[PDB]
Amino acid sequence: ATVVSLPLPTLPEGWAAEKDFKAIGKLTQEGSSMRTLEPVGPHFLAHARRVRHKRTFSEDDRIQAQAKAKKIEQDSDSDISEEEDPMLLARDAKDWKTQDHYKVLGLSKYRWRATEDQIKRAHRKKVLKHHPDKKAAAGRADDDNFFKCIQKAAEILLDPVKRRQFDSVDEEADIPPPTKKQLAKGNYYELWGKVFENEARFSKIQPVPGFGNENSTREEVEAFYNFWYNFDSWRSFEYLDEDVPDDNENRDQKRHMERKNANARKKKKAEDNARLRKLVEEAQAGDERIKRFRQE
Amino acid sequence: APGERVVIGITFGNSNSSIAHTVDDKAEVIANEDGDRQIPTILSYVDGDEYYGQQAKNFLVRNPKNTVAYFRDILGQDFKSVDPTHNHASAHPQEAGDNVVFTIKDKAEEDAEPSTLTVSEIATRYLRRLVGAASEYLGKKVTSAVITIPTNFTEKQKAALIAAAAAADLEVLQLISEPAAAVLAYDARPEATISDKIIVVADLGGSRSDVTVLASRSGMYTILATVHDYEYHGIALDKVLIDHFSKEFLKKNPGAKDPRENPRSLAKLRLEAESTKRALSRSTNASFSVESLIDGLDFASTINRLRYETIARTVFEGFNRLVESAVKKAGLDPLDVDEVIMSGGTSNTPRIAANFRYIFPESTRILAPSTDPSALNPSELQARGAALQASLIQEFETEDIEQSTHAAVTTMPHVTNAIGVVSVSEKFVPIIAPETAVPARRTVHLDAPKEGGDVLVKVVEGSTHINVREKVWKIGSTLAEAAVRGVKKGAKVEVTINVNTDLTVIVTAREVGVRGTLS
Ligand SMILES: Nc1ncnc2c1ncn2[C@@H]1O[C@H](COP(=O)(O)OP(=O)(O)OP(=O)(O)O)[C@@H](O)[C@H]1O
Ligand SMILES: [Mg+2]
């Protein structure tokens, strides 16, 4: 019995009940939950003694259905998005930096959107199916190139920073400029907002506002404009960087190449900011809400 | 026979195994002929003689085609699900029927055709050797054992294990999970105190990592979650150290051929990196020395804790992301966890234990060798818990065990929310902890008012809520209201809540009385 140094409420005046007790509520099956115990330990053995006394022969088959209420094991599809990879992607000749990703791991329709568990699960499926050890007799020695591709993709994508940089450098899933003259009649209040969510990947604040519709309030539209105007990209493009000897004649050599790398990345980053603002401006010019707002 | 049997506890992992017995109701781990208590799960054949353990690992380099290892997972598994990544060293499994097989030379004569032994045959032989070594240590013939297994062994794998034991003349009384063995190893100690705790079992092995979340109340535990990661581990640290040292060899000898291609060099480097990492765990500084690694040339170096930690930092945050992934999968918060036990060989290293100490608040107790004086060996936890279970279960008969291990006994209505009493001052006090299985009677002692007299005990439902971080209780539906008349000033009021199976709730508030029933 646990002793706790906390005081009880004084009884209000004029309160009574049969034997000074009042029943208000009860526990429900929704207020409970069925989990299954592990048959280990002296207290479980004593509980098993009591149950064997109460029921003798156990109705395992009958209570299996009731045990089914909660399950703590799961299985997944063998290949959710089986990709043909024509001719083994033309035998997928090892070409570092150039090679695409996500498609080899068969996570297409997800790309930047994924979770570690899904990534590892896909990795294991891919390695098991294509591992040379398992199917070597059936001419898998040739598929060593693809196997190295699998490992390179796994290492590039599992580590958070490397995956984030690869995503920014070449997602290969960016939609073209919205509401082009050919794509006329697409709603300016929907297509553009969709582009914003598709291009909010690097947003430093999670509750990103939305374009809205014809009736959207002034405060919200203004906040949306301010947020986009004052952005803060974490993005950068280093997967395409020039290579250097892994064993490098000490610190000096890395700095010497870093020079070129730094000027290239800064100019590139500036150009990316330029394009981003150029889109923001196109949207500001197109948007009609401001034109009515100023006249009023 | 019930009168006469010999039971032991066995832990059987991918990397290593262990055996244990009980002396004077205290579990002790058995050392084999080589003096090892953590016996590598490796088998090797030389001139038709069967060797296992340290001798086999030493002979690994010498015998390329006669060593088999990491076969624990392969047991009871189909060809489609075979995992061959760690099996490159081991002989290539050949798909014969539905049972993959290893082809090795187990005969003594040099011109004999190699045998094609099954994985079941190999597990059987390994269990014979383990039982035999236990037999020499005990002076008696071992007849029974409880063996630990992970929670994700399929029924086919369990059947394969029991068939292997039967072929090894060993009857398995029960299979228990490693988290259950680890918790029992502590709970069954003389000094242990039973109490409601959220327990995280982190079993960090060689080829695998397991994080399991359990609620342990009234000396009985309920599984909330479990995760198993195959990517980050001590073998991966072994590869990164082999890489870095390979670097150093390449720089020291300009032009030297790359170590990776030669299998002999690969095996020598891994074994020596394992030795060095264990030494650096042992103390502040460690040394690495390889003799005739290539072309008869020799090499040495020295490494220290901090540098090793820096070169191995990424795996540490991999373990971190795994542990938060597990807690999120269990729907809990680090403020909700009470104790985290570090199990397995990798758990010994101080840095990981300190890292979990930095992740979790100070109220959480980390049971790891380097952060607690009363901790037990993480490599001995599973084997001692298995031996303790194999000891305590001796009384019951075989049919009795089959009945005690059926679903009709283990399954019962666990009450999700909490039951407590409202305290007011000029707050929810829990009596029945949340997620508690049916009749777990509890009792609290509360303070009387400033002067006392008539006092109101209002029992309500309760739920946990996290406020940004600090955990508070939230009062929900009201269950009962009772009164105690004329309580003395400064006296204590005893309140008992019993939520019997039938879902009947009995409430008692006696001063040291009012009683009530909720159907
Ligand atoms: N003497 C030792 N003390 C502690 N750890 C060791 C020792 N020798 C090796 N190790 C390492 O400890 C780890 C083994 O931990 P653990 O006991 O959890 O594994 P296991 O029981 O063999 O297998 P599993 O991971 O499948 O449960 C490996 O990484 C191994 O390299
Ligand atoms: Mg282990």
Side-chain angles (χ1 to χ4, degrees), chain A residues 1-82 84-170 173-231 233-234 236-247 249-295, chain B:
Chain A
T2 61
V3 174
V4 58
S5 299
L6 286 181
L8 270 173
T10 317
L11 186 64
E13 306 171 14
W15 183 99
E18 307 86 3
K19 290 152 292 186
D20 280 325
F21 190 86
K22 182 191 302 181
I24 295 94
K26 293 171 291 294
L27 296 181
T28 62
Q29 302 295 331
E30 298 87 3
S32 76
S33 50
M34 185 63 72
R35 292 91 63 187
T36 299
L37 295 163
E38 288 303 291
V40 183
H43 298 284
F44 179 89
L45 278 56
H47 185 74
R49 288 172 187 253
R50 304 192 294 270
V51 191
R52 293 194 310 270
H53 293 89
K54 185 186 178 182
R55 304 182 181 186
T56 62
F57 47 73
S58 304
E59 60 188 4
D60 179 271
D61 290 343
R62 296 184 180 179
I63 198 165
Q64 190 54 7
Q66 197 200 354
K68 292 179 179 179
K70 292 181 47 83
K71 214 60 179 172
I72 190 180
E73 55 91 13
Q74 194 45 282
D75 187 21
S76 64
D77 292 328
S78 58
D79 43 3
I80 303 175
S81 55
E82 184 44 79
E84 178 68 16
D85 291 331
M87 294 182 286
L88 190 74
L89 291 184
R91 63 92 172 176
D92 190 5
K94 328 169 190 57
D95 204 355
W96 186 256
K97 277 74 69 178
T98 62
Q99 267 166 343
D100 199 21
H101 294 57
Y102 290 163
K103 68 172 296 305
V104 294
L105 192 64
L107 288 178
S108 55
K109 181 266 290 180
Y110 275 90
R111 319 274 321 180
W112 65 286
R113 286 317 328 280
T115 70
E116 58 154 40
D117 62 300
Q118 297 146 359
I119 297 169
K120 54 188 60 74
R121 177 46 51 231
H123 182 216
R124 161 160 285 189
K125 304 182 190 185
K126 207 44 176 177
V127 64
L128 301 178
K129 54 207 275 190
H130 293 283
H131 200 72
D133 285 3
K134 181 180 178 180
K135 308 291 182 57
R140 280 297 188 248
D142 292 330
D143 188 75
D144 284 331
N145 296 322
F146 183 71
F147 182 75
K148 268 81 74 175
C149 296
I150 299 176
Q151 282 72 242
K152 299 166 189 187
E155 60 204 279
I156 294 192
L157 292 62
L158 63 87
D159 175 66
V161 57
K162 298 156 42 176
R163 167 177 149 89
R164 178 53 146 94
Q165 66 84 36
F166 185 52
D167 291 330
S168 194
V169 61
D170 189 358
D174 57 288
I175 72 183
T179 315
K180 61 173 179 174
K181 177 54 181 93
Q182 292 71 60
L183 282 179
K185 291 75 71 179
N187 188 209
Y188 214 82
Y189 298 98
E190 290 157 9
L191 180 53
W192 290 88
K194 291 194 290 289
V195 186
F196 287 106
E197 298 103 11
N198 189 8
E199 293 292 349
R201 316 168 181 180
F202 324 107
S203 173
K204 279 205 175 27
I205 312 297
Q206 312 333 290
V208 171
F211 211 78
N213 50 359
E214 61 86 19
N215 55 348
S216 306
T217 311
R218 298 181 65 103
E219 294 294 324
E220 299 78 308
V221 304
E222 183 179 1
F224 165 75
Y225 291 165
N226 307 143
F227 158 73
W228 280 102
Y229 292 165
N230 312 342
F231 185 69
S233 166
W234 292 274
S236 56
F237 293 169
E238 288 75 32
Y239 189 51
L240 61 91
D241 215 20
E242 183 261 8
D243 290 330
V244 99
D246 185 314
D247 165 4
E249 182 70 25
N250 301 317
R251 267 181 69 94
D252 62 5
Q253 285 309 356
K254 277 74 70 176
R255 285 176 151 261
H256 185 74
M257 283 74 75
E258 193 58 42
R259 295 273 159 222
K260 277 80 70 180
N261 294 342
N263 67 281
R265 60 180 55 98
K266 62 182 77 71
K267 69 181 54 65
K268 179 265 300 179
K269 183 46 149 286
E271 190 276 333
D272 186 8
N273 299 343
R275 179 172 41 91
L276 171 58
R277 301 207 45 265
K278 180 68 174 66
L279 278 296
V280 186
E281 309 322 315
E282 292 308 349
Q284 185 174 355
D287 206 350
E288 65 89 21
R289 309 173 193 176
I290 59 173
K291 100 179 180 299
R292 58 134 297 180
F293 291 154
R294 77 210 300 120
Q295 63 84 30
Chain B
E4 201 57 39
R5 290 179 295 178
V6 180
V7 303
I8 59 170
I10 302 180
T11 295
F12 182 41
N14 63 27
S15 308
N16 72 19
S17 297
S18 45
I19 45 179
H21 191 71
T22 63
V23 59
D24 191 73
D25 303 333
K26 289 169 190 150
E28 193 266 5
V29 291
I30 300 171
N32 70 341
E33 308 88 340
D34 300 334
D36 286 321
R37 286 151 140 74
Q38 291 333 290
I39 200 56
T41 314
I42 188 182
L43 210 61
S44 180
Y45 291 164
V46 175
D47 302 309
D49 197 325
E50 185 183 67
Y51 293 166
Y52 69 91
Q54 66 79 19
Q55 301 178 359
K57 40 173 288 283
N58 164 37
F59 309 145
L60 182 63
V61 181
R62 295 285 74 78
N63 45 29
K65 293 328 179 314
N66 301 345
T67 299
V68 64
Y70 275 139
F71 46 84
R72 190 268 295 258
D73 291 87
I74 304 170
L75 276 172
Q77 202 176 12
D78 181 68
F79 187 75
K80 306 323 291 181
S81 295
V82 71
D83 175 24
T85 61
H86 314 97
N87 311 346
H88 293 62
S90 188
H92 167 232
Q94 289 285 345
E95 184 191 17
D98 199 5
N99 293 327
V100 285
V101 289
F102 302 91
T103 300
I104 55 186
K105 182 64 194 293
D106 55 354
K107 278 75 69 182
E109 60 275 59
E110 304 169 90
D111 264 5
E113 193 261 349
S115 301
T116 305
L117 317 167
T118 68
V119 58
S120 176
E121 164 79 25
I122 299 298
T124 286
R125 297 183 171 189
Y126 182 76
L127 293 177
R128 269 97 64 86
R129 291 301 216 110
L130 264 183
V131 174
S135 289
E136 289 99 11
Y137 180 77
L138 288 182
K140 57 176 150 293
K141 184 268 182 179
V142 173
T143 74
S144 314
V146 167
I147 309 174
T148 59
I149 53 170
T151 58
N152 201 26
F153 277 172
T154 73
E155 69 179 295
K156 174 169 160 49
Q157 292 185 290
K158 293 181 184 177
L161 179 61
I162 188 64
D169 295 330
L170 174 66
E171 67 92 19
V172 172
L173 290 177
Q174 183 182 4
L175 297 185
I176 63 176
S177 69
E178 288 90 5
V183 295
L184 264 294
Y186 282 134
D187 279 5
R189 283 187 314 184
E191 78 273 39
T193 191
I194 63 163
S195 179
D196 304 348
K197 62 179 190 181
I198 296 291
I199 192 66
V200 168
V201 176
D203 189 358
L204 294 174
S207 177
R208 184 265 298 163
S209 288
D210 184 2
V211 176
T212 308
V213 188
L214 270 284
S216 185
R217 327 166 306 287
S218 68
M220 64 180 179
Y221 58 90
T222 80
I223 61 175
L224 295 74
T226 185
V227 297
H228 300 101
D229 188 21
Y230 64 92
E231 271 88 331
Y232 293 100
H233 40 83
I235 299 170
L237 284 64
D238 294 356
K239 275 86 73 179
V240 71
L241 275 295
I242 297 169
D243 289 301
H244 160 261
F245 285 17
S246 286
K247 218 46 165 304
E248 294 177 346
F249 166 66
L250 290 175
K251 293 179 179 179
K252 81 162 185 176
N253 296 115
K257 67 92 177 178
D258 192 292
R260 275 75 169 183
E261 53 264 17
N262 181 253
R264 247 70 170 174
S265 297
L266 278 164
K268 190 221 191 171
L269 293 152
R270 44 209 60 191
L271 63 87
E272 191 70 9
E274 177 271 330
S275 168
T276 58
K277 60 94 176 184
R278 290 294 87 192
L280 183 62
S281 186
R282 297 285 74 78
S283 79
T284 65
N285 296 115
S287 56
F288 190 104
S289 297
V290 289
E291 281 61 48
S292 184
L293 72 164
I294 305 160
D295 269 349
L297 187 153
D298 204 303
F299 163 81
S301 66
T302 290
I303 204 61
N304 58 6
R305 298 229 192 218
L306 279 296
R307 180 91 201 97
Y308 176 25
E309 190 265 3
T310 60
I311 305 167
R313 292 183 291 113
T314 191
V315 67
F316 292 161
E317 297 86 10
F319 292 166
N320 293 326
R321 78 190 67 119
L322 270 293
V323 66
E324 287 98 13
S325 67
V327 70
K328 266 72 185 175
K329 187 171 174 174
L332 299 175
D333 187 282
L335 295 168
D336 290 321
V337 175
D338 194 332
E339 206 296 322
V340 65
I341 62 170
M342 294 298 102
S343 186
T346 307
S347 298
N348 290 296
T349 289
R351 191 285 169 273
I352 192 69
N355 189 1
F356 303 157
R357 190 269 170 290
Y358 293 106
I359 296 302
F360 292 165
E362 192 271 331
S363 58
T364 304
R365 177 67 283 200
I366 300 90
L367 291 199
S370 180
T371 181
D372 193 292
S374 69
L376 297 166
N377 191 342
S379 291
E380 296 187 357
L381 297 183
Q382 305 330 121
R384 283 169 309 105
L388 287 160
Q389 193 69 28
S391 170
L392 295 192
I393 71 176
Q394 56 184 350
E395 310 297 325
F396 317 114
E397 312 288 29
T398 310
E399 193 47 87
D400 202 30
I401 301 299
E402 281 103 8
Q403 292 194 6
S404 304
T405 58
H406 275 149
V409 174
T410 184
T411 294
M412 75 192 180
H414 293 51
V415 161
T416 299
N417 54 3
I419 300 96
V421 66
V422 180
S423 173
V424 76
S425 296
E426 68 286 0
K427 43 176 191 293
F428 174 85
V429 178
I431 311 173
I432 300 294
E435 64 191 19
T436 289
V438 300
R441 182 206 308 177
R442 295 295 184 182
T443 306
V444 294
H445 294 133
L446 291 175
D447 297 331
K450 299 73 181 191
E451 266 83 3
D454 296 353
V455 70
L456 170 64
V457 175
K458 59 188 301 293
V459 178
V460 304
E461 298 184 36
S463 290
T464 175
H465 206 183
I466 308 298
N467 288 334
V468 175
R469 308 179 70 93
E470 269 86 12
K471 187 185 71 168
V472 67
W473 289 94
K474 177 168 59 179
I475 296 181
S477 309
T478 302
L479 287 163
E481 288 184 12
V484 189
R485 299 296 187 176
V487 181
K488 293 171 72 167
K489 170 187 181 171
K492 281 185 176 298
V493 183
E494 181 271 332
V495 176
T496 309
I497 297 298
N498 196 355
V499 49
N500 265 19
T501 303
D502 62 358
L503 182 146
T504 293
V505 174
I506 305 181
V507 184
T508 292
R510 295 173 67 251
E511 78 285 13
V512 57
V514 54
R515 77 177 180 74
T517 301
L518 321 180
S519 304

